[PDB]
Scaffold this active site. Structure first.
Site, PDB file in Angstrom:
ATOM      1  N   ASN A  37      44.149  34.038  42.978  1.00 33.17           N
ATOM      2  CA  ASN A  37      43.975  33.590  44.361  1.00 33.17           C
ATOM      3  C   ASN A  37      42.942  34.473  45.056  1.00 33.17           C
ATOM      4  OD1 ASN A  37      44.697  31.968  46.667  1.00 33.17           O
ATOM      5  ND2 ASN A  37      45.963  33.666  47.439  1.00 33.17           N
ATOM      6  N   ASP A 107      45.102  39.305  38.979  1.00 31.70           N
ATOM      7  CA  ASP A 107      45.780  38.781  40.174  1.00 31.70           C
ATOM      8  C   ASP A 107      46.829  37.764  39.705  1.00 31.70           C
ATOM      9  OD1 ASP A 107      45.381  36.566  42.769  1.00 31.70           O
ATOM     10  OD2 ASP A 107      45.626  38.675  43.331  1.00 31.70           O
ATOM     11  N   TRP A 108      46.814  36.555  40.253  1.00 35.12           N
ATOM     12  CA  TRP A 108      47.747  35.528  39.811  1.00 35.12           C
ATOM     13  C   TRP A 108      47.485  35.074  38.391  1.00 35.12           C
ATOM     14  CZ3 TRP A 108      52.448  34.594  41.211  1.00 35.12           C
ATOM     15  CH2 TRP A 108      52.858  34.875  42.522  1.00 35.12           C
ATOM     16  N   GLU A 131      43.658  44.886  38.068  1.00 38.53           N
ATOM     17  CA  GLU A 131      44.169  44.505  39.392  1.00 38.53           C
ATOM     18  C   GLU A 131      45.172  43.367  39.229  1.00 38.53           C
ATOM     19  OE1 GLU A 131      43.869  45.375  42.828  1.00 38.53           O
ATOM     20  OE2 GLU A 131      43.606  47.285  41.750  1.00 38.53           O
ATOM     21  N   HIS A 271      39.910  45.087  44.944  1.00 41.33           N
ATOM     22  CA  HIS A 271      40.730  44.109  44.245  1.00 41.33           C
ATOM     23  C   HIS A 271      39.937  43.174  43.379  1.00 41.33           C
ATOM     24  CE1 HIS A 271      44.119  41.614  43.229  1.00 41.33           C
ATOM     25  NE2 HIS A 271      43.591  40.536  43.823  1.00 41.33           N
TER      26      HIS A 271
HETATM   27 CL   LIG Z   1      48.056  35.850  46.726  1.00 41.40          CL
END
Ligand SMILES: [Cl-]
Ligand SMILES: [Ca+2]
Length: 294
Positions: A37, A107-108, A131, A271
């Protein structure tokens, strides 16, 4: 190098009555790149070229993101993790990946990829991660400055912030990249989310699904499951650490630094470190892959 140009050409395939878009270039065992995301396959455009010729280079757009179809009807109960996983599992299946996959995750993409990897452990040759959601989170794992915003995504305020104002794309994204993005770069990130309303739903459903402080309970359990498995798996791993980093620091980083059979490098970034150190990231992944595929 950097650059605003996408890697390869978008391909499409029908999954569960919807079209999903993906990049799939070259031959051999997959090197499988999964964005999170609010990004897309586009996140990997300057990283994927370093792996030219080392296998089949694949980057999928999650349902409702990149060039993948929106869910219809979209609403507050759509785009849960379980929903994204259903679409992604089916897509990955349809792609005929074989049983020697290298995963590259963020991330996701890491929650999804770590989960898939635990469930398909025999098919997984290597995991490169950055990350990443290494484990269930606590509010103390979030940089202080970003806590209130993420808490507000997980409140009644979230629809206005995100569906109305596109805050995840327009504020969080550039805010966690150290170098200034170009016009063309932001255009590509903005594109799946140009329209206000349900088009932006995946970017709000995602922060509502983050396994933090016990909630949501299904995503917490999945993350506790893969946390335990990854800390024990002998599968080779490449941890791409970031300075100052963002998510994977402190306790989170403490934990993933306990994982076995792991190489680590550190690159500049917060990030979305792909936008800050693409070449350093690409080169480490390629070396990792070379070592796993002599
Ligand atoms: Cl998120
Ligand atoms: Ca910035």
């Amino acid at each position: 190098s950097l650059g605003a140009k996408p890697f390869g050409e978008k391909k499409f395939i029908e999954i569960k009555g919807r079209r999903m878009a993906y990049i799939d270039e070259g031959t051999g065992d997959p090197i499988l790149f999964q964005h999170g995301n609010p990004t897309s396959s586009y996140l990997w455009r300057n990283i994927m070229p370093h792996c030219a010729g080392l296998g089949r280079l694949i980057a999928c757009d999650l349902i409702g993101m990149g060039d993948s179809d929106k869910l219809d009807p979209s609403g507050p109960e759509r785009y849960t993790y379980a929903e994204h996983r259903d679409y992604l599992d089916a897509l990955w299946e349809a792609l005929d990946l074989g049983d020697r996959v290298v995963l590259v995750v963020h991330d996701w993409g890491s929650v999804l990829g770590f989960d898939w990897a635990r469930r398909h452990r025999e098919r997984v040759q290597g995991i490169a991660y950055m990350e990443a959601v290494a484990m269930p989170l606590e509010w103390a794992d979030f940089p202080e400055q970003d806590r209130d915003l993420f808490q507000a995504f997980r409140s009644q305020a979230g629809e206005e912030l995100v569906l109305q104002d596109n805050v995840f794309v327009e504020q969080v994204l550039p805010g966690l990249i150290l170098r200034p993005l170009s016009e063309a770069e932001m255009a590509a990130y903005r594109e799946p989310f140009l329209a206000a309303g349900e088009a932006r739903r995946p970017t709000l459903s995602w922060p509502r699904q983050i396994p933090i402080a016990g909630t949501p309970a299904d995503v917490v359990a999945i993350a506790r499951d893969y946390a335990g498995w990854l800390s024990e798996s002998p599968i080779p791993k490449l941890f791409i650490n970031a300075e100052p980093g963002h998510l994977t620091t402190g306790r989170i980083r403490d934990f993933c630094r306990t994982w076995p059979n792991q190489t680590e490098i550190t690159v500049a970034g917060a990030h979305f470190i792909q936008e800050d150190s693409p070449d350093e990231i690409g080169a480490a992944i390629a070396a990792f892959v070379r070592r796993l595929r002599p």
